[PDB]
Write an enzyme that holds these catalytic residues in place. Structure first.
Site, PDB file in Angstrom:
ATOM      1  N   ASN A  25      69.710  58.443  39.343  1.00 38.73           N
ATOM      2  CA  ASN A  25      70.964  59.079  39.760  1.00 38.73           C
ATOM      3  C   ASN A  25      70.773  60.063  40.921  1.00 38.73           C
ATOM      4  OD1 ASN A  25      70.097  61.648  38.770  1.00 38.73           O
ATOM      5  ND2 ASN A  25      70.808  61.130  36.712  1.00 38.73           N
TER       6      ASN A  25
ATOM      7  N   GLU B 144      70.258  44.182  51.990  1.00 38.70           N
ATOM      8  CA  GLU B 144      69.280  44.294  50.900  1.00 38.70           C
ATOM      9  C   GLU B 144      69.059  42.909  50.289  1.00 38.70           C
ATOM     10  OE1 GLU B 144      70.584  46.436  47.402  1.00 38.70           O
ATOM     11  OE2 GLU B 144      68.556  46.475  46.543  1.00 38.70           O
ATOM     12  N   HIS B 145      70.166  42.280  49.868  1.00 37.39           N
ATOM     13  CA  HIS B 145      70.145  40.925  49.299  1.00 37.39           C
ATOM     14  C   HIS B 145      70.952  40.019  50.225  1.00 37.39           C
ATOM     15  CE1 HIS B 145      70.250  43.575  45.605  1.00 37.39           C
ATOM     16  NE2 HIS B 145      69.293  42.758  45.189  1.00 37.39           N
TER      17      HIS B 145
ATOM     18  N   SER C 176      73.339  50.035  47.220  1.00 39.41           N
ATOM     19  CA  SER C 176      72.853  48.650  47.257  1.00 39.41           C
ATOM     20  C   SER C 176      73.815  47.754  48.017  1.00 39.41           C
ATOM     21  CB  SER C 176      72.650  48.151  45.835  1.00 39.41           C
ATOM     22  OG  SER C 176      71.642  48.979  45.249  1.00 39.41           O
TER      23      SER C 176
ATOM     24  N   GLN D 169      76.730  42.053  42.340  1.00 41.13           N
ATOM     25  CA  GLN D 169      76.345  43.234  43.113  1.00 41.13           C
ATOM     26  C   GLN D 169      77.345  44.377  42.869  1.00 41.13           C
ATOM     27  OE1 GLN D 169      74.230  45.583  44.592  1.00 41.13           O
ATOM     28  NE2 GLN D 169      73.475  43.559  45.242  1.00 41.13           N
TER      29      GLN D 169
ATOM     30  N   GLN E 161      63.677  66.779  36.162  1.00 39.61           N
ATOM     31  CA  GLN E 161      62.523  67.344  35.458  1.00 39.61           C
ATOM     32  C   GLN E 161      61.416  66.298  35.323  1.00 39.61           C
ATOM     33  OE1 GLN E 161      65.496  67.270  32.525  1.00 39.61           O
ATOM     34  NE2 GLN E 161      65.988  67.405  34.703  1.00 39.61           N
TER      35      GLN E 161
ATOM     36  N   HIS F 250      76.772  46.844  40.131  1.00 43.82           N
ATOM     37  CA  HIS F 250      75.577  47.690  40.214  1.00 43.82           C
ATOM     38  C   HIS F 250      75.940  49.165  40.410  1.00 43.82           C
ATOM     39  CE1 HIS F 250      72.105  49.678  42.169  1.00 43.82           C
ATOM     40  NE2 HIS F 250      71.364  48.814  41.495  1.00 43.82           N
TER      41      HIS F 250
ATOM     42  N   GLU G  24      37.690  60.051  78.359  1.00 40.95           N
ATOM     43  CA  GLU G  24      38.564  60.941  77.592  1.00 40.95           C
ATOM     44  C   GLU G  24      38.014  62.367  77.566  1.00 40.95           C
ATOM     45  OE1 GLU G  24      39.542  59.436  73.639  1.00 40.95           O
ATOM     46  OE2 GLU G  24      41.084  58.160  74.495  1.00 40.95           O
TER      47      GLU G  24
ATOM     48  N   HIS H  42      31.629  62.860  71.306  1.00 40.68           N
ATOM     49  CA  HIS H  42      31.769  61.427  71.009  1.00 40.68           C
ATOM     50  C   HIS H  42      30.763  60.627  71.837  1.00 40.68           C
ATOM     51  CE1 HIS H  42      35.488  62.287  68.883  1.00 40.68           C
ATOM     52  NE2 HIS H  42      35.679  61.003  68.625  1.00 40.68           N
TER      53      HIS H  42
ATOM     54  N   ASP I 238      66.954  39.114  39.966  1.00 37.84           N
ATOM     55  CA  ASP I 238      66.988  40.415  39.327  1.00 37.84           C
ATOM     56  C   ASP I 238      66.248  40.413  38.034  1.00 37.84           C
ATOM     57  OD1 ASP I 238      68.411  41.763  41.207  1.00 37.84           O
ATOM     58  OD2 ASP I 238      70.370  41.485  40.273  1.00 37.84           O
TER      59      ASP I 238
ATOM     60  N   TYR J 286      59.845  55.738  36.711  1.00 33.24           N
ATOM     61  CA  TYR J 286      61.010  56.384  36.127  1.00 33.24           C
ATOM     62  C   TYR J 286      62.068  55.331  35.770  1.00 33.24           C
ATOM     63  CZ  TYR J 286      64.948  59.217  34.987  1.00 33.24           C
ATOM     64  OH  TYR J 286      65.945  59.863  34.261  1.00 33.24           O
TER      65      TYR J 286
END
Lengths: 431, 431
Positions: free
Chosen positions: B208, B323-324, B234, B256, B185, B259, B411, B416, B357, B127
């Protein structure tokens, strides 16, 4: 004992035959599990001890099993059992140690050094079910890789009273703390932490419905913890050609059937005579099983399918993606490259499911219920993380600067672009 | 508002400085998204067109982008931009190809062969958001490892009209089908499949609030699909010593900050003078940014922290797990061994966040919001699965039989155990 002839089946019958049990996540199970989680998060040990008084009613005092209790448990086990666990641990260690990701360190272009390193998950909690029969083998499967990964904290929970075998297995594999708590409350205790149980980063090991719903819920809460993998009914799919031994096929179908009443047991074979003989073998062998109601129940959903050839067996298995795939054909090894989805594969006549469940060295914690589509067998990787590292020299950066500026500008990310320009200009001044 | 002296803070304030703002989700969005997912699965292309009619100025017609449209888009792009994307893809391909797992094939004991092999995730969907600015770099980050892994189906969805840059990046990386569908969707179309959109096993790429909620929902539905990773704000954490260049530090903090408004921007430095110089540089650079509103917003939550020394900077970063992580210190490489948690690490003055990046070769899809505790940077591994295989020979099975019987008996798993006994007896009969 009703053989299904795959190619006489309408397309609809074929689709229905490969469906898995519809999920019944009881709103009551989710409600109860949610109240348990909230309560444990809010009241810690107090809430745990309350559940201890109700459920299984053992009145727990210290949640942590003492070193003395572990030593007493260990003395009671036979040398025969201790030695068998040692063979198992040795093989599990050998296989999982061989999974260590070798170093990734490459210059994509001169002066642009990119690496991939690994770091262990810092804290891990292991869950082991209770009941009259002790499932201590799972302790070996979970604690061994955690140890190889270098996890700093490794703890384990199991419903009290915890069986001697589980305590010994935990000690054998370096588990640090063993706690007298089971079910949803144990998972909540590990996910949120309490006065006695540490909050861990990741929770491992399967359980009953409540345990499964608990692991589900904590994995989705920001205040919770990560889990090893989703769960669902277990499965076995055996592919048998005309040279297979019916009793061997049957023995593996029954091995899976005794795992739980929701187990999916499937045989695919190109010979009707083989399906019939396996059905008869299953019946005779079941009659000899002392605790057989569970297996009997699982067999209600079994499908003994006659296909037209081995190609179709592979096609059906790949569409299904069985948790355990057992290939009892004379050319088993040659079929492996064509298997695209399965949790663990067993080859030939002398690789019973039991061998993998206990001592061959492979892990018996596997994806099921269709999760083989994207999940893997539990392994070393699940106890660690891949971290990326990069270092560009002046030369490397200078050679890539225009490319970066062009891309950032096209994405209209001006600050990203300016980070490059500032450096290019400093390098020009120092040249 | 300005410089925080770490050691002057109370223990409580220190814990708070490392917390992440927590926000989940409105019931409103959850409802809206659940309805979209149900409608798409139930009504397919018809539902997608109805959604398009309500939002787009011109209702979508062909859901699939044609080869002609892709060709016309490629012709409009500059050679400069195409060449820059080629350099990036080449580096991404080199680093990700280097992540291939070597063969794991070992005899844990003679005649007991255990292997771990890899298989690709069969179908994956990507996506990519729309908007005024084309974020095509993510296409290169996702479609490249998918190709290397050998994923059979690779498709992409993005809100129409899809920018020329996105269409070119898709074609460059071998994406088979590109669809004119966006938002929740699109996530539903990929997770469930429609007449035009194939159902994929796993979905990659951030988006989003609606896209994020749709990915969360499909990842938890048995009829849905797996996702690359949970989402969240982020983050960047820069460790800078007295030898750092204020403008370089500031440039990475601002990279950053642009972003998103929820980005977490942190500086750790043993020098109050450095912190002051960085704060000033951030303000001056921000003033030169064309569309600085998002960055300004993120900066209100920034923390410029003065520590006692670099060892303390490492302690704080490890507790946070950014993260970074950007290390602008004299001996940056030596500090890496002590870093236990971070998504992607950048070393020295010439390793801006922008390099990773866009084109050094590392992946920019990374764990954040604390998920660095157990999750890894997106890599080849996220597009494949580890499958284990075992084959015991008659000899290997015979040597391990007693051990397996002992463990199964302990067991109380009779089937088994019987699976072993049947084979042991068959072998005796044979010799």
């Amino acid at each position: 004992n009703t053989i299904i002839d795959w190619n006489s089946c309408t397309a609809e019958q074929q689709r229905q035959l490969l469906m898995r049990p519809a999920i019944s996540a009881s709103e009551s199970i989710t409600r109860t599990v949610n109240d348990i989680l909230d309560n444990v998060k809010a009241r810690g040990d107090e809430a745990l001890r309350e559940y201890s008084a109700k459920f299984d009613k053992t009145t727990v005092t210290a949640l942590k099993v003492s070193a003395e209790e572990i030593a007493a448990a260990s003395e009671r086990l036979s040398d025969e059992l201790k030695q068998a666990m040692a063979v198992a641990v040795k093989n599990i260690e050998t296989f999982h140690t061989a999974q260590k990701l070798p170093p990734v360190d490459v210059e994509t272009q001169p002066g642009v050094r990119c690496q991939q390193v690994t770091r262990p998950v810092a804290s891990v909690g292991l869950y082991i079910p209770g009941g009259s029969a002790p499932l201590f083998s799972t302790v070996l499967m979970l604690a061994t890789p955690a140890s190889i990964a270098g996890c700093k904290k490794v703890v384990l929970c199991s419903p009290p009273p915890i069986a001697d075998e589980i305590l010994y297995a935990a000690q054998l594999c370096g588990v640090q703390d063993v706690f007298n708590v089971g079910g949803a409350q144990a998972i909540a205790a590990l996910a949120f932490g309490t006065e006695s149980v540490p909050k861990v980063d990741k929770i491992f090991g399967p359980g009953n419905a409540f345990v499964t719903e608990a692991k589900r819920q904590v994995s989705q809460r920001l205040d919770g913890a990560a889990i090893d993998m989703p769960a669902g009914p277990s499965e076995v799919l055996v592919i048998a050609d005309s040279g297979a031994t019916p009793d061997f096929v049957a023995s593996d179908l029954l091995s899976q059937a005794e795992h739980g009443p929701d187990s999916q047991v499937i045989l695919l074979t190109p010979a009707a005579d083989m399906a019939r003989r396996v059905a008869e073998a299953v019946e005779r062998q079941l009659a000899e099983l002392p605790r057989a109601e569970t297996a009997r129940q699982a067999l209600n959903a079994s499908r003994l399918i006659v296909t037209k050839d081995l190609a179709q067996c592979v096609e059906i298995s790949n569409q299904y993606g069985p948790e355990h795939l057992i290939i009892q054909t004379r050319n088993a090894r040659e079929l492996v490259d064509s298997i695209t989805s399965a949790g663990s594969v067993f080859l030939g006549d002398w690789s019973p499911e039991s061998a993998g469940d206990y001592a061959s060295g492979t892990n018996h914690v596997l994806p099921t219920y269709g999760y083989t589509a994207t999940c893997s067998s539990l392994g070393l990787a699940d106890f660690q993380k891949r971290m990326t590292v990069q270092e560009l020299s002046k030369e490397g950066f200078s050679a890539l600067a225009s490319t970066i500026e062009t891309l950032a500008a096209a994405e209209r990310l001006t600050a990203h672009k300016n980070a490059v320009t500032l450096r290019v200009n400093a390098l020009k001044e120092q040249a």
